[PDB]
């Protein structure tokens, strides 16, 4: 029964369950890696010795937190729970490759663990920039294990994207216009499309690098007419679409929780919402070289890339103003999901504006790969996507398990993690403007004070992680049920029981003729 239901799962509810479990485990691993990094960066000196092992720690932090936590949490997990219940589908379109992609993920995590085991280590970062990852600087197998973990995660993401696109544009009720679905479906649709168009790009790049090492070829070897700049181009043509992957279901989740707990029967400017989503999806592929302003590109190319980066800045601002407009006029129920959404709005605003300050090109000629960039993507990702994950997590938990959350303790978690991430991530503005680069295991005397403040705030965030896992235990132990759910008339997922049964939508929805 156990091996029939869970190891051989063919229903999206339990598939999202196992997504949530794997995402929680990866969040634990990434939290431990971040705490170890801050243990380096809370007191000057070689607490571990060499910084190669520290680079292994930061590489594992980046890989585990991006590919194994955020995407399996909200893209796989929340999508797999929600979008059949959102569009009235009985199941996903191809649940068998959905299960394949899920069970593809723990081999990727295991290959990354084996990479950490190998004595060479993955001392490269999220960027796997050759010739650092070549046979001379890394004479080992660890970077090959990382590349194969990227292969596993990439083919899982491709399969999930195909399944999500097929489910979205196929098995909505036939009288429904495509411009009538809830916005999380649109967000995960644009997410899956960009996954589909950007994951073969990583496949090409990492096969290029794997062939460069193991098969004596010269794709990025300067001694054979190759160039690492090609890998940088391919990897960032991956990279900025991938960070928009990591932010788009955040847009959907925050829009849904705002329009739920704000009392509005509809979000403000649905057409503007969908237009902004497709606009940042379209422009996410032609701005990939804003990470390339110091490499040595042509200057008119740099001017075009920063101008197009402003063009990607504008419709995100349209999205933010539509969120403020749909917040306007509604009575605010003080559930913790609104607290997460408001934290997302403000912290994502300041993170995106920090991204604009980076996006000015000469400001990257002064400010590339410092801790200013660290502050930017930890504002917009490490608590943008994280706060969106938290909002969806504390919102749909009565739908996921049947047990509610107690508002006082849940808000206590929110307040402590908000304070912890702010204290962690606000000093790196001064750290980057004062001018220390990334991937350092020890820092100078000017940066000592803000590094210590950031590490202390990171320990506050760790205490928040403890209170979260205690809260999951407390919900699962107290087992208080759901008496009723409001706004189920507008939100289709909440009306089929908390939790919904194994076989949902066995009778299709009667969609209006108009």
């Amino acid at each position: 029964m156990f091996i029939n239901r869970w190891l051989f799962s063919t229903n999206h509810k339990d598939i999202g369950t196992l997504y949530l479990l794997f995402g929680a485990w990866a969040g634990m691993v990434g939290t431990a890696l971040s705490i170890l990094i801050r243990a380096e960066l809370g007191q000057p000196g070689a607490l571990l010795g060499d910084d190669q092992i520290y680079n292994v720690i930061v590489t594992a932090h980046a890989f585990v937190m991006i590919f194994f936590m955020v995407m399996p949490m909200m893209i796989g997990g929340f999508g797999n729970w929600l979008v059949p219940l959102m569009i009235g589908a009985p199941d996903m379109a191809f649940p068998r490759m959905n299960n394949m992609s899920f069970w593809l993920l723990p081999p990727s995590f295991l290959l990354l663990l084996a990479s950490s085991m190998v004595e060479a280590g993955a001392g490269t970062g999220w960027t796997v920039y050759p010739p650092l990852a070549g046979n001379l600087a890394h004479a080992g197998a660890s970077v090959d294990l990382t590349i194969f973990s990227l292969h596993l995660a990439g083919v899982s993401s491709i399969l999930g994207a195909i399944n999500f696109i097929t489910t979205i544009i196929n098995m909505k009720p036939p009288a429904m216009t495509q411009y009538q679905t809830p916005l999380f479906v649109w967000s995960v649709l644009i997410t899956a499309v960009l996954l589909l168009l950007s994951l073969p790009v990583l496949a090409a790049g990492i096969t290029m690098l794997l062939t460069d090492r193991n098969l004596n070829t010269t794709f990025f070897d300067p001694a054979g007419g190759g160039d690492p700049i090609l890998y940088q181009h391919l990897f960032w043509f991956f990279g900025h679409p991938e960070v928009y992957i990591l932010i788009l279901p955040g847009f959907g989740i925050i829009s849904h929780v705002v329009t739920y707990y704000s009392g509005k029967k509809e979000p403000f400017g649905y057409m503007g919402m969908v237009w902004a989503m497709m606009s940042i999806g379209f422009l996410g592929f032609i701005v990939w070289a804003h990470h390339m302003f110091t490499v040595g590109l042509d200057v008119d190319t740099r001017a075009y890339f920063t101008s197009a980066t402003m063009i990607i800045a504008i419709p995100t601002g349209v999205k933010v103003f539509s969120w403020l407009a749909t917040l306007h006029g509604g009575n605010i129920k003080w559930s913790p999901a609104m607290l997460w959404a408001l934290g997302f709005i403000f912290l994502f605003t300041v993170g995106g504006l920090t991204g604009i300050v980076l996006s000015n090109s000469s400001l990257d000629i002064v400010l590339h790969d410092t801790y200013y960039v660290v502050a930017h993507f930890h504002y917009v990702l490490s608590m943008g996507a994280v706060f969106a994950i938290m909002a969806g997590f504390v919102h749909w938990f009565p739908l996921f398990s049947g047990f509610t959350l107690d508002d006082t303790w849940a808000k206590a978690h929110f307040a402590i993690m908000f304070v912890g991430v702010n204290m962690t991530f606000f000093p790196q503005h001064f750290l980057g403007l004062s001018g220390m680069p990334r991937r350092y295991s020890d820092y100078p005397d000017a940066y000592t004070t803000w590094n210590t403040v950031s590490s202390m705030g990171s320990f506050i965030s760790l205490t928040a992680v403890l209170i979260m896992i205690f809260m999951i235990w407390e919900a699962f132990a107290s087992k208080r049920e759901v008496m009723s759910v409001s706004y189920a008339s507008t939100n289709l997922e909440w009306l089929h029981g908390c939790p919904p049964p194994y076989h949902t939508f066995e009778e299709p929805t009667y969609v209006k003729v108009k």
Binding site: L136, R213, N216
Partner: protein, 76 residues
């Protein structure tokens, strides 16, 4: 009518076209007896940074001793 037309194109255009291209290559392969180029140890050719995971690590998967010299020379 479509299926007939495609059958006619396959038999009267595609098959004669493949016959002419095969005859072209077959006649060329009988007249051409290529003068193996002299070995020059160009530093950008025959690069070996790591041995291959097969054989002696120095022969390519589709090695041909007559046309593919090693980093040291031809094998003969």
């Amino acid at each position: 009518g479509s299926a007939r037309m495609w059958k006619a194109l396959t038999y009267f255009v595609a098959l004669p076209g493949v016959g002419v291209s095969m005859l072209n290559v077959f006649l060329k392969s009988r007249h051409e007896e290529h003068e193996r180029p002299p070995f020059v140890a160009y530093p950008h050719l025959r690069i070996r940074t790591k041995p291959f995971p097969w054989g002696d690590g120095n022969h390519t998967l589709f090695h041909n001793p007559h046309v593919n010299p090693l980093p040291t020379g031809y094998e003969d």
